[PDB]
Structure 1
Amino acid sequence: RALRVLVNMDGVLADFEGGFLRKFRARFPDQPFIALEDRRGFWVSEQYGRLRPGLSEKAISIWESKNFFFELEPLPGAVEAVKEMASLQNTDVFICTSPIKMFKYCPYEKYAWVEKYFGPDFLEQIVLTRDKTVVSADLLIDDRPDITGAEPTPSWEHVLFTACHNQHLQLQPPRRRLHSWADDWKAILDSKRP
């Protein structure tokens, strides 16, 4: 009866693409890289793997490093928008994020990042899961085009959040985008209310 909205973290709240590129270039200044305008497909490591053998493993080593997740910059408007959204009447917001395989730093730093930008009281709103389809909600705002898992008919509508890797993608109607946090996210939420 409160509208429930799942908001993804990497590529929606946290600038994974830009943080990765900067750190990759700083660590591997003699390697070729992929400019953001040229990113295609969800998996960074796969595109880097195509660019030259060995580069996939080098890419992976950036996000496996300590402080990678913690030092991500918020995307413009993201912190303000989610704080406003959570404050709305009849609206519950959860941050729904999928950790990487190597778990030494990533879960911890994701909690630390949410504490930093949203405060201790928001920590209760975090859901860490590899499968978003088993999380029930009205909406999922997420930059990954294809979201699948154990539940063949998730309860949420997936609204595709624009990112460099999906900006050229034609979606199957009636699939819907949120173009950035400057875009009219309130209209999207309202479209789902009784």
Structure 2
Amino acid sequence: SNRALRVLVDMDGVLADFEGGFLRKFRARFPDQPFIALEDRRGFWVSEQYGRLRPGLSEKAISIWESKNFFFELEPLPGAVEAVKEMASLQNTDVFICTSPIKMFKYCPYEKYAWVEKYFGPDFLEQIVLTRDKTVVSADLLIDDRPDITGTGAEPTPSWEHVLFTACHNQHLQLQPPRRRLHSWADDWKAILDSKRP
């Protein structure tokens, strides 16, 4: 609730299970192709790992998340909806969902709004920021599964502290101190927010 601590919450990999949705739909569509089990995922870009696996598989992978209903049908991560609803109800706390669309824009922007409406309600649509460059969005915190966030972004010194949210693709990564992780929504996110308050 609305100086408020401002928290940017990423969508794919934090609220929505992109990795699991992708794998399931990839195996269904391309049952004769090899795949990458989640525990074996390494690196942020799915299509790059698939492209190394077999020739043509980058393009096949892309075709999964370019398809209609891919984004809309993603399942929420455990605890994500509940945590963000609670976070948004806290005193002196403003929550925005900060998400980057894919390059093919026929479905993805629309479906992200629709997904937010479905899980958070119409009033939360006000809190969505769509951008490929999150460094130009000012906040105290950014909770996001992408390790390299600057990429490179236009703002060399973002205002936010990036808290890395654990995902299959980043779980083994050693971070440079003092970078921090949120391991799951079961982990103590309130303590992370409180550490940034006056």
Q: CA deviation at 1:32?
A: 0.1
Q: CA deviation at 1:83?
A: 0.1
Measure, in 1, the Cα distance between the counterparts of 2:179 and 2:43: 18
Measure, in 1, the Cα distance between the counterparts of 2:177 and 2:52: 31
When the two structures are superposed, what TM-score results if normalisation uses the length of structure 2? Answer: 0.98
Measure, in 1, the Cα distance between the counterparts of 2:136 and 2:104: 22
**Range 140-149 or range 89-98, more displaced:** 140-149
**Range 142-151 or range 40-49, more displaced:** 142-151
% same residue:
99
Q: CA deviation at 1:70?
A: 0.1
> Which residue number in structure 2 is paired with residue 127 of structure 1?
129
Measure, in 2, the Cα distance between the counterparts of 1:126 and 1:117: 13
Report the 3-state secondary structure (helix = DSSP H, G, I; strand = E; otherwise coil) of the residue aligned with 1:92.
strand
Measure, in 2, the Cα distance between the counterparts of 1:162 and 1:149: 22
Measure, in 2, the Cα distance between the counterparts of 1:95 and 1:163: 18
Q: 1:113-132 CA deviation, whole Å, 9 max, x = no partner? A: 00000000000000000000
1:184 is aligned, of 179, 183, 188, to 188
Q: CA deviation at 1:79?
A: 0.1
Measure, in 2, the Cα distance between the counterparts of 1:136 and 1:52: 40
Report the 3-state secondary structure (helix = DSSP H, G, I; strand = E; otherwise coil) of the residue aligned with 1:30.
coil
Measure, in 2, the Cα distance between the counterparts of 1:27 and 1:21: 10
Q: CA deviation at 1:182?
A: 0.2
> Superposition RMSD on alpha carbons, in Å?
0.4
Q: 1:85-115 CA deviation, whole Å, 9 max, x = no partner? A: 0000000000000000000000000000000
Q: Are 1:162 and 2:166 counterparts?
A: yes
**Range 154-163 or range 143-152, more displaced:** 143-152
Report the 3-state secondary structure (helix = DSSP H, G, I; strand = E; otherwise coil) of the residue aligned with 2:31.
coil
Would you identify which runs of 4 or more consecutive aligned residues in structure 1 move more than 3 Å?
none
Aligned residues: 194
Q: CA deviation at 1:191?
A: 0.2
Report the 3-state secondary structure (helix = DSSP H, G, I; strand = E; otherwise coil) of the residue aligned with 1:124.
helix
Measure, in 2, the Cα distance between the counterparts of 1:88 and 1:179: 21
Q: 1:119-153 CA deviation, whole Å, 9 max, x = no partner? A: 00000000000000000000000000011400000
Report the 3-state secondary structure (helix = DSSP H, G, I; strand = E; otherwise coil) of the residue aligned with 2:168.
coil
> Which residue number in structure 2 is paired with residue 175 of structure 1?
179
Q: CA deviation at 1:72?
A: 0.1
When the two structures are superposed, what TM-score results if normalisation uses the length of structure 1? Answer: 1.00
> Which residue number in structure 2 is paired with residue 14 of structure 1?
16
Report the 3-state secondary structure (helix = DSSP H, G, I; strand = E; otherwise coil) of the residue aligned with 2:96.
strand
Q: CA deviation at 1:22?
A: 0.1
**Range 75-84 or range 144-153, more displaced:** 144-153
Q: CA deviation at 1:20?
A: 0.1
**Range 142-151 or range 67-76, more displaced:** 142-151
Q: CA deviation at 1:58?
A: 0.1
User: Any stretches of 5+ residues in structure 1 without a counterpart?
Assistant: none
Q: 1:2-44 CA deviation, whole Å, 9 max, x = no partner? A: 0000000000000000000000000000000000000000000
User: Any stretches of 5+ residues in structure 2 without a counterpart?
Assistant: none
Measure, in 2, the Cα distance between the counterparts of 1:158 and 1:129: 16
Measure, in 2, the Cα distance between the counterparts of 1:38 and 1:87: 37
